Structure formats: structure tokens, C-alpha cells
């Protein structure tokens, strides 16, 4: 009876400003595991130019449950950006645990303003790299 119950996934998207993804198009991370015997599979999904018309000015960011042994899992999540010093910034966290099923995601449609992200003065794209950080806590398997 042993489980990975908390985990932090760090994802670097190189040459971010030159990403060709238009509105609605997704960038998908590699799959990562947790729970008992790697039985929970996750990934991240980002819309560099927003999910829809409302989020056009934003990067949209989601955590997707790919696979689980039962019907659902309930989990809290926090997304942030790592700056040039490797420090967390622009954090957003779920207000509570959310119900994930296979093929379902949860996240923030308006995670960060694109213009603020792209402005070199803000230091969020050092060497034009976006580093996203997702910390997950699983309440139930």
C-alpha cells in the first residue's frame, strides 16, 4: 500500500515566441505518472493563443488525466511560471480538488496575458524559453 500522492512536473517549451499554434490548437506535454504502481497517467495541454474567442489575449493551460484504474480521481493543482532565476511566478491554484476522468482536463483558460508573457522586460521567456511548473496533489484515486 504505497502511492506517489504529490508531484511536480516541469515543462520547457523552447523558442516559445515562435510557436505556430493558432487559437484552439494545443501543445501537449509528455505523459507522466503517479499513484500506486504508476497507475495514474497525466499530461499538460497549453493553448499558446487561447482556447476560444474570450481567451484570445491569453495563454490557456490545463492538466489532463490520461489514464486511471477506476472511474475517477480527485486532485488539487497549481500552475506557475519559472523565471530566469528558476523562481516561481504568476501562480494560480485550484480552489479545491476537481473530479478528473479519462480524457478530461481542468485548468485556467485565462492563465496569463500573452502580451505580458511576450514582453522581454518581464523576464518570463529567458532565451525565449517558457518553463511551466505544475504541482499536483491527489485526494482520491
Amino acid at each position: 500500500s504505497g502511492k506517489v500522492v504529490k508531484f511536480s512536473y516541469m515543462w520547457t517549451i523552447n523558442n516559445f515566441s515562435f510557436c505556430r499554434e493558432e487559437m484552439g490548437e494545443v501543445i501537449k506535454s509528455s505523459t507522466f505518472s503517479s499513484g500506486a504502481n504508476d497507475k495514474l497517467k497525466w499530461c499538460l495541454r497549453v493553448n499558446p493563443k487561447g482556447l476560444d474567442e474570450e481567451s484570445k489575449d491569453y495563454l490557456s493551460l490545463y492538466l489532463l488525466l490520461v489514464s486511471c484504474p477506476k472511474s475517477e480521481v480527485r486532485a488539487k493543482f497549481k500552475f506557475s511560471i519559472l523565471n530566469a532565476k528558476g523562481e516561481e511566478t504568476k501562480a494560480m491554484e485550484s480552489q479545491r480538488a476537481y473530479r478528473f476522468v479519462q480524457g478530461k482536463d481542468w485548468g485556467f483558460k485565462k492563465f496569463i496575458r500573452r502580451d505580458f508573457l511576450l514582453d522581454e522586460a518581464n523576464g518570463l521567456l529567458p532565451d525565449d524559453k517558457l518553463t511551466l511548473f505544475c504541482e499536483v496533489s491527489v485526494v482520491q484515486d
Binding site: 493553448n47 482556447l51 490545463y62 476537481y98 478530461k104 482536463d105 481542468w106 485548468g107 485556467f108
Partner: peptide
Amino acid sequence: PEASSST
């Protein structure tokens, strides 16, 4: 912050 799903 308001969480939402992309489906």
C-alpha cells in the same frame, strides 16, 4: 481563480 475544462 476559476478553474474550467477544455471540453
